[PDB]
Amino acid sequence: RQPIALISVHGDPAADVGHESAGGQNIYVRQLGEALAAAGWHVDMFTRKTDPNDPDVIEHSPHCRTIRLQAGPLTYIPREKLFETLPKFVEAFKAYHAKYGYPLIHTNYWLSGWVGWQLRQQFNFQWLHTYHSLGVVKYQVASEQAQRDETRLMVEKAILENADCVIVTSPQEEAYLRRWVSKAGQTRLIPCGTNLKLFYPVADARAQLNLPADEPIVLYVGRFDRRKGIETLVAAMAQIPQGQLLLVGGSDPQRSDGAERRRIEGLVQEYNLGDRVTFVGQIDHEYLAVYYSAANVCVVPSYYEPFGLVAIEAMACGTPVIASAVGGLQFTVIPEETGLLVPPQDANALANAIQRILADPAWARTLGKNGRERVQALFNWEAIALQMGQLYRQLFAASL
Ligand SMILES: O=P(O)(O)OC[C@H]1O[C@@](CO)(O[C@H]2O[C@H](CO)[C@@H](O)[C@H](O)[C@H]2O)[C@@H](O)[C@@H]1O
Ligand SMILES: O=c1ccn([C@@H]2O[C@H](COP(=O)(O)OP(=O)(O)O)[C@@H](O)[C@H]2O)c(=O)[nH]1
C-alpha cells in the first residue's frame, strides 16, 4: 500500500476549527486524508507543532496520521511570519521521506507549497497543490491587505509553473490564476465538498437552542477577520427593526484574529444593537447544523472568499445564503435559486437582501431546499472524495 504526504503547515488537521489559522483548509485536509485512508492509501498529514504539551502524532482513522513537525519556535506564529520557519520544516520532513519515500505529495497552502517546491528540486514525486487563497486576489482590497507580500506572489507563481497538478476549487480560482498569475501549469477543477451526514435539516433546532420560534434570526458563521466583513453585516442590522444576529466564531484576545479585530462589539455599541446581537463563540463543527437550521438566513458578507465553505454548509441544512459576489461564493450560490448575491461593502444592498427573505418565509424555505439539492448535486464530499481518489490513481499511474 502506497503512502501519501499531505503538507498543511499552519493548518493542523487535528485542530478544532473556528478561529485563527483554523477553518476550511483544516477541514479540507482532514476529510481528504481520512477519505483516502478509507480507500487504501497510507496518509501522513504534516503540520507544525505549536505546543510541546501537544501530541507529536495523532492517529485519527486507520492508516491516517497527523504529524506535528518541530519547525520553528514551539509557540503560535501567525502565517504571515512563518516563512523563516519553512526550511527547518523541510529538514523535519525529510526523515519521514527517508522512511516511506512518498510517491505523491499534496501541499495545501502557499507556505507548504514552498516546502513542496523545495522538495521538488531534490526528489521525484507527483506534486499537487491547493492554494486555499490567492495573494493576488487578497492584495486588491480598499480595506486591509494593501500591505502586500511579494514573496507570496513569487512563490504562488512558482508553484503553478512547477507543480504537477493544481487543484482549483472554483472556476473563478482558475480565472484569477490565468489572468493574474500565469498561463502555464496543469489545473483541475475539483470543488470543495461538505459532509451531508454532518449537515442536514434538523427540524428541532430552535427548541434545542431555546430560541423563540416566531422571532427572526440572521446567522453568521466564520472567523473574525476584516476579510469576512462583519462590519457591513452589523451596519445592515440597523436597517432591520426586528431580528437578532448570531455571530458564531472563535477568537483569542492574545491574537490578532481575536479581540484586536473583535471590535465588532464596539460596533455593537455604536449602532445601539446590544439587545439584538449575540456573540455565540466557537461551536463544534459537528454541531453547527443546529445553528444553520435554526436560522432564516446565513450571511457570508465577505470582501473575498475563495470558495466560502459555510455557504455549502448552510445550503446543506436547508437555509438560504446571502453572500458577497466575490469568489467561489458566486460559484456556490445561484443568485435566485438558492439565495442572493450582493456587492461587498454596502450595507444598504445587504439590508434590502435580508428584507426580501424575512418578509417571505416560504420563499426562503424553498430557496433552502434548492440549496440542499444543489449541495447534494455538486458539493457532496462523498462523491468529491471519489473524484480526488481517481485523480491520485491516474497521477500515480505515471510509472515506467
Ligand atoms: O486570508 P489569508 O491570509 O489568505 O488566509 C487564507 C485563509 O483561508 C483558510 C481558512 O483557514 O481557508 C481557505 O481555504 C478553504 C478551503 O480551500 C476555503 O474554504 C476558505 O474560503 C479559504 O479562505 C485558510 O487557508 C486561511 O486562514
Ligand atoms: O465555530 C465555528 C466557526 C466556523 N467553523 C468552520 O470553519 C470553517 C471555515 O469556513 P470557511 O471556509 O468558509 O472560511 P475560512 O475560515 O476557511 O477562510 C467552516 O467549516 C466553518 O464551519 C466551525 O467549525 N466552527
Numbering used by the authors: 27 to 426
What did the publication describing this PDB structure actually write?
In the present study, we solved the co-crystal structure of Thermosynechococcus elongatus SPS (TeSPS) (Uniprot code: tll1590) with S6P and UDP. Although crystallization of TeSPS alone was unsuccessful, addition of UDP did induce crystal growth, indicating that this ligand stabilized the protein for crystallization. Therefore, we decided to soak the TeSPS:UDP co-crystals with S6P in an attempt to stabilze the structure further and increase resolution. In doing so, we were able to obtain a dataset at 3 Å resolution. The crystal structure of TeSPS (residues 27–426) showed that it is a GT-B type glycotransferase as a monomer. Overall, our resolved structure showed that TeSPS has 16 α helices and 14 β sheets, with UDP and S6P being bound at the interface of A- and B-domains. The N-terminus (residues 27–220) and the α6 helix (residues 406–426) formed the A-domain, and the C-terminus (residues 221–405) formed the B-domain, with two loops (connecting α6 and α6’ and α7’ and β8, respectively) linking these two domains. In our structure, TeSPS is in the closed conformational state. In particular, UDP and S6P stabilize conformations of the loops in the catalytic center in which the uracil moiety of UDP is inserted into a cavity formed by loops 1, 3, 4, and 5. Hydrophobic residue Leu335 that is proximal to two phosphate groups from UDP is forced to reorient, and the terminal phosphate (P1) of UDP is stabilized by interactions with basic amino acids, including Arg249 and Arg253.
